[PDB]
Amino acid sequence: SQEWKEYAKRVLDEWEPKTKLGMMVKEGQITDIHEIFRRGYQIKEPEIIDVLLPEVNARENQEVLDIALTVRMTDSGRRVRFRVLAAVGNRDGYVGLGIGHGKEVGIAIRKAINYAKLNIIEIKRGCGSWECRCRRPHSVPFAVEGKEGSVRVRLIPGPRGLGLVIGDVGKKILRLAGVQDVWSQTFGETRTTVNFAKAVFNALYNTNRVAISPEMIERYGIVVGRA
Amino acid sequence: GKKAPNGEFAGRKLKLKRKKFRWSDIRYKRRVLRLKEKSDPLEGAPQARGIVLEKIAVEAKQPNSGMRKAVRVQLIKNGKVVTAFCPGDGAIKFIDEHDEVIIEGIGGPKGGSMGDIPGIRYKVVKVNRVSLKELVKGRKEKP
Amino acid sequence: TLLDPLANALSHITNSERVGKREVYIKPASKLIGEVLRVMQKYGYIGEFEFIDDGRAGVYRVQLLGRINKAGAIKPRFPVKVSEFEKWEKRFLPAFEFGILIVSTSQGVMSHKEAIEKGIGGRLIAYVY
Amino acid sequence: EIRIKEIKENKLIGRKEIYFEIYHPGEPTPSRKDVKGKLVAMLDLNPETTVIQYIRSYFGSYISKGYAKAYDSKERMLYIEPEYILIRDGLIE
Amino acid sequence: KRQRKKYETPPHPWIKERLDRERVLMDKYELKNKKELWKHETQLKNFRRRARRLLAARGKQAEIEREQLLARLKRLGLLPEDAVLDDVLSLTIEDILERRLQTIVYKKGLARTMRQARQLIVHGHIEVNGQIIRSPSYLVLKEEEDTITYARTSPFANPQHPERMMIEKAKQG
Amino acid sequence: MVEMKFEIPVCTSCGREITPREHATHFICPNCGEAVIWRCESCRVLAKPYKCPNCGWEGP
RNA sequence: CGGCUUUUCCGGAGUGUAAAAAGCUCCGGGAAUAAGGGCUGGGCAAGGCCGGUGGCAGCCGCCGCGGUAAUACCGGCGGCCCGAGUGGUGGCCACUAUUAUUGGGCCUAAAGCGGCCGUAGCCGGGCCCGUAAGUCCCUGGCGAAAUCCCACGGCUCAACCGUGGG
């Protein structure tokens, strides 16, 4: 923890705020991460979030999902290009996904992680299974459906200690989302990793779309982000 | 429109439609009329005991180039004659003319010809009751 | 031609609230529609609902509170006893005890939660969450 | 060492059933004759009217169960009890 | 009717994460086969299934079975005496593993190693309440652990068996 | 562990909560000038009218 | 290198028969003394160097490998999965929402008949009254045993068996 605070202070020194959102996170009247989400500004500087959520920089909090090797081509050759899909996030309900183009492996990795940082979102969590009911945000609060491309994904709450029963892409995405047990159903082509990952991301984002009265906030221990 | 019929008193048609279209399936048709169990030369037998008649080889499908050894087996059970691929390195020499042999399906897609060699359906396991794999390894001896 | 007022009404409500209007008018008003409208309003899903004497079949006026996510009438009136009720909760609701269902028991149209303690079966009529 | 739990009298047969336990920690299983001469002492029975069928020693157990019968007259065994446990006890050649 | 296997194989023989998560426990607890670990996993899974079944049940038989389940879980020494139906979902494999006879007999300091304790058990040298068991996989109850001593007939019930002093020094060390 | 229970804003026109990356807006009341009026993206796109909580002024 | 017990291993003693054998149970002599199978390019990804053949020989469930460097054939070593098990093949379920009631599609990918009418069948407007067949709640008789779930108890435990509840 203290190392993360040290890194936060370091970047607070080095970074100079360009976008309007930079000042009040450098000046320090914003300390909550959810302050960014609630009002609905826009994020463009990668330094904005690691000040409040430096844990992204951990090697266990960042994951490289796939390394696609695409090919433009001309009369005088096939010019390759790297497209890397990778995810970052703290394990308390804040995750981002990114795709990075490049000409080398490392360049794509860097750009992908940087863009993933900008895709940070807030994840409601809970316990809505018919067998757990433990009021701890160990899983989704309710069953949700996400769509992207052809792929559709249904995430159903599951009991404690079951683990994530889902494809490895959703496995990693949810593991970085601070969720431990969920039933998964996948419709469409799941071989294309990118659409699957994006659909999982969109489902997690759609969790916040459901209207909730406080009674179920108590009933499932619904947490908006950090628990 | 809406998938039909959805009526509470529509059991007859809801059943008839499904039964009818289950015939559009091919695997179910293949089972219930048992025509796998009427076209089979092996009559649903994962093994059979046959006599060899002559050794033949076939050209691998392109771009695969080579010579795939095999033999021709008439079946003592019923009398049909089929090709029989022989595996192993230089194993054609081990399999001789007029040999009691044990033959078994080759486990390709749907039981079809395996991999890069066409037509064939079966491979040899035991020759004169002696397992061919060891004889490829030379551990045993043909009687 | 029209076949079922209730499912049309529930689809009307859902579609009208997806865009997010405020006052919704349902044309084919009947008694069962009113008995239905009682239930969820008793759970605070909708605001006021009232009946307007048109002169042909009556209209139903409802104010929408923006609470419902999906509200639809299960058509084929599945009769369900008590002890197996859970087998249908997994089919129409997003989570444990999220939302409700409407059953027409011997004692009238009324919410499913209130039927568990009343110990009455009946035929599923609609659902909302 | 042998210690009793069950001593039950069947008066339709006029015969005594004895269920007893033998403590044999660390030594080989006792034989039929030894326990036969052991019980008769402190139960004070006629040896010829007394017969044993089974003595079961369990796996990994130093305490073994055993059952014996104690009749009154020399004809009761010849009539009622089967012929094996006289031969196994030597009562019949 | 044909007697069925009591344990469940993993759905995939070659997943890295599951393989290594197995291997760490195999080296830690030193079981002969992954079959044993799978058996104990299934043993857990039975409790989990019973718990999740009962939690959604309304009826007298449901409650009665629930109380019986809680009672026998507590009897095994898995749970505290005031446990409820909600905490079983948080149980782990290691909670079962520590209750294994081999594990417990080692934690009594009666062996210098897991394998040494296993050898003593399988060679009929460890007694429970004066009874000998030759199965290190056995799971002990909460009312018998105090009876775990050396078998009387064993040479190691004798306090000067040459291995015994080394065992007790290791206990000291 | 402090549970920092934030107040997720709610739109005035419809009452729906505001998801993180929504393009919603927050602005001061048009007539009483003290009440904060939120407007969610769905409310914004079709521009359905909104009403003040304080003075009951109506404004798209 | 030093020490420890003997899984089995020879003898004796119980049971065993109504004949033993079973070697089931206890004691004594007592040696470290039984382990293979498959895989090693990827889909399986768990796992790499060398010798040999060089589009021949062969391997290969699918993708692929070899026209002289083969990390993919064969030999050696190394390594990997499982374990008195392990491989090949054939039949069945799932994988599959590729049988779609739950739960699929039919403009361009197989898939709306050129169009209309119309019988059976199916699906049908609102309100009141009656009936109560369906529908729902309660209750009597009844669906054998065996199998299945759980507690306890017996055989080391287990399996197995019984007592009790379902």
Whether residue D27 contacts residue D13, with contact meaning beta carbons closer than 8 Å, is answered with no
User: In terms of Cα–Cα distance, which of B92, B87, B117, B91 is closest to B104?
Assistant: B87
User: In terms of Cα–Cα distance, which of E149, E103, E104 is closest to E128?
Assistant: E149
Q: Token match 């796939």: residue?
A: A66
Q: Are strands D50-57 and E126-128 parallel, antiparallel or unpaired?
A: unpaired
Q: How far apart are CA A165 and CA A139, in angstroms?
A: 12
Please state whether strand G lies within 7 Å of residue C105 at its CB atom. yes
User: In terms of Cα–Cα distance, which of A101, A96, A13, A3 is closest to A49?
Assistant: A96
**Phi-psi region at A199: left, alpha or beta (left = phi > 0; alpha = psi -120 to 50):** alpha
User: Which chains contact A through at least 3 pairs of Cβ atoms less than 8 Å apart?
Assistant: C, E, F
Residue E47 identity = F
- For residue E163, which nucleotide's C1' is closest to its Cα? G4
Structure solved using which method? cryo-EM
Q: How far apart are CA A183 and CA E52, in angstroms?
A: 15
Residue E30 identity = E
- Give the list of residues 6+ apart from residue A79 with CB closer than 8 angstroms, or none: A71, A72, A73
Question: From the C1' of G149, which residue's alpha carbon is nearest?
Answer: E50
Is there a contact between C69 and A216 if contact means CB atoms under 8 Å apart? no
With a CB-CB cutoff of 8 Å, which residues 71-130 of chain E face chain A? Answer: 86, 89-92
Residues forming a β-bridge with C100: C128
- Cα C80 to Cα C85, C89, C101, E163: the distances in Å are 7, 11, 12, 70
Distance B137 CA to G74 C1' (A): 11
Distance B115 CA to G45 C1' (A): 21
- Give the list of residues 6+ apart from residue E95 with CB closer than 8 angstroms, or none: E78
Whether residue B88 contacts residue B136, with contact meaning beta carbons closer than 8 Å, is answered with yes
Q: Is B20 helix (H, G, I), strand (E, B) or coil?
A: helix
Q: What are phi and psi of E168, to 5 degrees?
A: -70, -30
Q: Is E92 exposed, middle or buried (0-12, 13-18, 19+ CB in 10 A)?
A: exposed
Is there a contact between A141 and C95 if contact means CB atoms under 8 Å apart? yes
How many CA atoms lie within 13 Å of A203's alpha carbon, on the beta-carbon side? 30
Whether residue D74 contacts residue D49, with contact meaning beta carbons closer than 8 Å, is answered with yes
Distance C18 CA to G126 C1' (A): 29
C-alpha Rg value of chain F to the nearest Å: 13
**Phi-psi region at C75: left, alpha or beta (left = phi > 0; alpha = psi -120 to 50):** alpha
For residue C11, the surrounding DSSP H or E stretch is helix C5-19
Tokens, residue A3? 């190392």
Tally the residues of chain A: 227
Q: How far apart are CA C99 and CA C44, in angstroms?
A: 11
Cα-Cα-Cα-Cα dihedral of D81, D85, D86, D90, to 10°? -170
Task: Show the CA angle centred on residue A95, arms to residues A92 and A99, nearest 5°.
Answer: 160
Tokens, residue D14? 């006029």
Tokens, residue D25? 């920690």
Cβ-based contacts (< 7 Å) between B 107-136 and strand G? 107-109, 111, 114-117
Q: Which residues of C touch A182 (CB under 8 A)?
A: none
Task: Give the distance from residue E167's alpha carbon to the nearest chain C alpha carbon, in angstroms.
Answer: 55
For residue B27, the surrounding DSSP H or E stretch is helix B27-32
- Exposure string of A82-97, with b = 16+ CB inside 10 Å and e = fewer, is bbbbbbbbbebbbbbb
Residue F19 identity = T
Distance E42 CA to G61 C1' (A): 31
Tokens, residue D55? 């003595």
Q: How far apart are CA F37 and CA F9, in angstroms?
A: 10
Tokens, residue E110? 């009666």
Residues forming a β-bridge with D10: D15
User: In terms of Cα–Cα distance, which of A27, A118, E127 is closest to D59?
Assistant: E127
Q: Does A133 touch chain C (CB under 8 A)?
A: yes
Whether residue A105 contacts residue A82, with contact meaning beta carbons closer than 8 Å, is answered with yes
Query: For A113-152, what is the HEC assignment?
Result: HHHHHHCCEECEEECCCCCCCCCCCCECCCCEEEEECCEE
Task: Give the distance from residue A107's alpha carbon to the nearest chain C alpha carbon, in angstroms.
Answer: 42
DSSP B49-115: EEEEEEEEEEEPPTT--SEEEEEEEEETTT--EEEEE--STTTTTTS-SS-EEEEEE---GGG-S-T
Q: How far is CA A120 from the centre of its chain?
A: 6
Q: How far apart are CA A123 and CA A225, in angstroms?
A: 5
Chain G positions with an atom below 7 A of a protein C-beta are 3-7, 11-19, 24-28, 44-46, 55-67, 73-75, 81-84, 88-92, 97-105, 112, 121-128, 134-138, 146-152, 155-160, 165-166
Nearest CA in chain A to F26: A39
Q: How far apart are CA D91 and CA E112, in angstroms?
A: 56
Whether residue D34 contacts residue D90, with contact meaning beta carbons closer than 8 Å, is answered with no
Distance B20 CA to G99 C1' (A): 10
Q: Is C50 exposed, middle or buried (0-12, 13-18, 19+ CB in 10 A)?
A: exposed
- Give the list of residues 6+ apart from residue E138 with CB closer than 8 angstroms, or none: E100, E101
Please give the tally of structural domains in chain B. 1
Q: What is the largest CA-CA distance in chain E?
A: 61
Q: Which of D23, D24, D27, D59 to mutate to test the interface with E (most CBs of E within 10 A)?
A: D59
Task: Show the CA angle centred on residue C50, arms to residues C48 and C53, nearest 5°.
Answer: 160
With a CB-CB cutoff of 8 Å, which residues 38-97 of chain C face chain E? Answer: 83, 86
Q: How far apart are CA E66 and CA B116, in angstroms?
A: 60
Tokens, residue D13? 């047969």
The neighbour count for residue E104, using CB atoms within 10 Å, is 22
Q: Is D67 exposed, middle or buried (0-12, 13-18, 19+ CB in 10 A)?
A: middle
Q: How far apart are CA A201 and CA C83, in angstroms?
A: 38
Please state whether strand G lies within 7 Å of residue D5 at its CB atom. no
Q: How far apart are CA E6 and CA A87, in angstroms?
A: 41
Residues forming a β-bridge with B68: B58
Sheet architecture: strand order including A94-102: A62-74, A77-90, A94-102, A121-122
Whether residue B78 contacts residue B43, with contact meaning beta carbons closer than 8 Å, is answered with yes
Is the torsion defined by CA of B93, B96, B101, B105 positive or negative?
Answer: positive
Question: From the C1' of G75, which residue's alpha carbon is nearest?
Answer: B137
Q: Is A27 helix (H, G, I), strand (E, B) or coil?
A: coil
Residue D81 identity = E
- For residue E61, which nucleotide's C1' is closest to its Cα? G166
- Kindly give the residue spans of alpha helices, DSSP state H, lying in D1-93: 32-43, 74-79, 84-87
Q: Are strands A182-187 and A164-165 parallel, antiparallel or unpaired?
A: parallel
Q: How far apart are CA E85 and CA E48, in angstroms?
A: 10
Distance C118 CA to G143 C1' (A): 30
**Where in the sequence is the domain holding B18, given as residue range(s)?**
1-143
User: In terms of Cα–Cα distance, which of C89, C93, C95, C113 is closest to C39?
Assistant: C113
Tokens, residue E105? 């007999």
Whether residue A153 contacts residue A170, with contact meaning beta carbons closer than 8 Å, is answered with yes
Residue B134 identity = E
Q: Is A60 helix (H, G, I), strand (E, B) or coil?
A: coil
**DSSP E strands, chain A:** 62-74, 77-90, 94-102, 121-122, 124-125, 144-148, 151-157, 164-165, 182-187, 223-224
- Kindly give the residue spans of alpha helices, DSSP state H, lying in F1-52: 41-46
- DSSP letter for D29, please: P
Whether residue A80 contacts residue A65, with contact meaning beta carbons closer than 8 Å, is answered with no
Q: Token match 């093994």: residue?
A: B47
Is the torsion defined by CA of B90, B91, B97, B103 positive or negative?
Answer: negative
Q: Does E153 touch chain D (CB under 8 A)?
A: yes
Tokens, residue C55? 């002169």
User: In terms of Cα–Cα distance, which of C63, C47, C45, C62 is closest to C99?
Assistant: C45
User: In terms of Cα–Cα distance, which of E94, E42, E93, E46 is closest to E69?
Assistant: E46
**Angle of the A193-207 helix axis to the A168-175 helix axis, nearest 10:** 40
Q: What are phi and psi of C49, to 5 degrees?
A: -130, 145
Task: Show the CA angle centred on residue E131, arms to residues E127 and E132, nearest 5°.
Answer: 60
Q: Is B119 helix (H, G, I), strand (E, B) or coil?
A: coil
Q: How far apart are CA F40 and CA F46, in angstroms?
A: 11
Cβ-based contacts (< 7 Å) between B 59-98 and strand G? 60, 63-69, 87-92
Whether residue D68 contacts residue D38, with contact meaning beta carbons closer than 8 Å, is answered with no
- Exposure string of D20-45, with b = 16+ CB inside 10 Å and e = fewer, is bebebeeeeebebeebbeebbeebeb
Whether residue B51 contacts residue B99, with contact meaning beta carbons closer than 8 Å, is answered with yes
- Give the list of residues 6+ apart from residue E112 with CB closer than 8 angstroms, or none: E166, E167, E170
Q: What are phi and psi of D65, to 5 degrees?
A: -80, 160
The neighbour count for residue A13, using CB atoms within 10 Å, is 8
Q: How far apart are CA A190 and CA A209, in angstroms?
A: 25
Residues forming a β-bridge with B73: B52, B82
Q: Which residues of A touch F14 (CB under 8 A)?
A: none
For residue A39, the surrounding DSSP H or E stretch is helix A34-39
Is there a contact between A37 and F20 if contact means CB atoms under 8 Å apart? yes
- For residue E49, which nucleotide's C1' is closest to its Cα? G149
User: Which chains contact E through at least 3 pairs of Cβ atoms less than 8 Å apart?
Assistant: A, C, D
How many CA atoms lie within 13 Å of C41's alpha carbon, on the beta-carbon side? 15
Is there a contact between C95 and A133 if contact means CB atoms under 8 Å apart? no
The neighbour count for residue B66, using CB atoms within 10 Å, is 11
Tally the residues of chain B: 143
User: In terms of Cα–Cα distance, which of A121, A167, A160, A116 is closest to A140?
Assistant: A160
Q: How far apart are CA C12 and CA A189, in angstroms?
A: 34
Q: How far apart are CA A217 and CA A135, in angstroms?
A: 9
Is there a contact between E89 and A133 if contact means CB atoms under 8 Å apart? no
Asked whether the bond before B5 is cis by omega within 30 degrees of 0, the reply is yes
Task: List for chain A the helix, strand, coil content (%; round to 5).
Answer: 35, 30, 35
Distance C34 CA to G130 C1' (A): 24
Residues forming a β-bridge with D64: D22, D57
Resolution (in Å) of the shown entry?
3.2
- Kindly give the residue spans of alpha helices, DSSP state H, lying in chain E: 16-29, 34-55, 60-75, 93-98, 101-107, 114-122, 162-172
Q: How far apart are CA E55 and CA E82, in angstroms?
A: 18
Q: How far apart are CA A163 and CA E44, in angstroms?
A: 14
Tokens, residue D50? 């007394």
Q: Is C124 helix (H, G, I), strand (E, B) or coil?
A: strand
The neighbour count for residue B40, using CB atoms within 10 Å, is 12
Residue C41 identity = Q
Task: Give the distance from residue C3's alpha carbon to the nearest chain B alpha carbon, in angstroms.
Answer: 13
Whether residue D16 contacts residue D69, with contact meaning beta carbons closer than 8 Å, is answered with yes
Please state whether strand G lies within 7 Å of residue B138 at its CB atom. no
Task: Show the CA angle centred on residue C103, arms to residues C101 and C106, nearest 5°.
Answer: 160
Q: How far apart are CA A109 and CA A106, in angstroms?
A: 5
Tokens, residue B24? 């559009």
User: In terms of Cα–Cα distance, which of C87, C83, C29, C90 is closest to C54?
Assistant: C29
Sheet architecture: strand order including A182-187: A144-148, A151-157, A182-187, A164-165
Q: Is A196 helix (H, G, I), strand (E, B) or coil?
A: helix
Distance E1 CA to G144 C1' (A): 19
The neighbour count for residue A66, using CB atoms within 10 Å, is 14
Please state whether strand G lies within 7 Å of residue B105 at its CB atom. yes
Asked whether the bond before B63 is cis by omega within 30 degrees of 0, the reply is yes
As for chain A, the residues directly before each break of C–N over 2.5 Å are none
- Give the list of residues 6+ apart from residue B55 with CB closer than 8 angstroms, or none: B69, B70, B71, B72, B92, B95, B97
Q: Is C41 helix (H, G, I), strand (E, B) or coil?
A: helix
- Give the list of residues 6+ apart from residue A153 with CB closer than 8 angstroms, or none: A145, A146, A147, A170, A184, A185, A186, A187, A196, A199, A200, A203
What are the counts of helices (DSSP H) followed by strands (DSSP E) for chain D?
3, 4
Whether residue A190 contacts residue A97, with contact meaning beta carbons closer than 8 Å, is answered with no
- For residue D57, which nucleotide's C1' is closest to its Cα? G25
Is there a contact between A130 and E56 if contact means CB atoms under 8 Å apart? yes
Q: Is A171 helix (H, G, I), strand (E, B) or coil?
A: helix
Q: Does E58 touch chain C (CB under 8 A)?
A: yes
Q: How far apart are CA F60 and CA F43, in angstroms?
A: 10
User: In terms of Cα–Cα distance, which of A145, A149, A157, A135 is closest to A210?
Assistant: A145
**Phi-psi region at F47: left, alpha or beta (left = phi > 0; alpha = psi -120 to 50):** left
Interface size, chain C vs chain F, as Cβ–Cβ contacts under 8 Å: 13
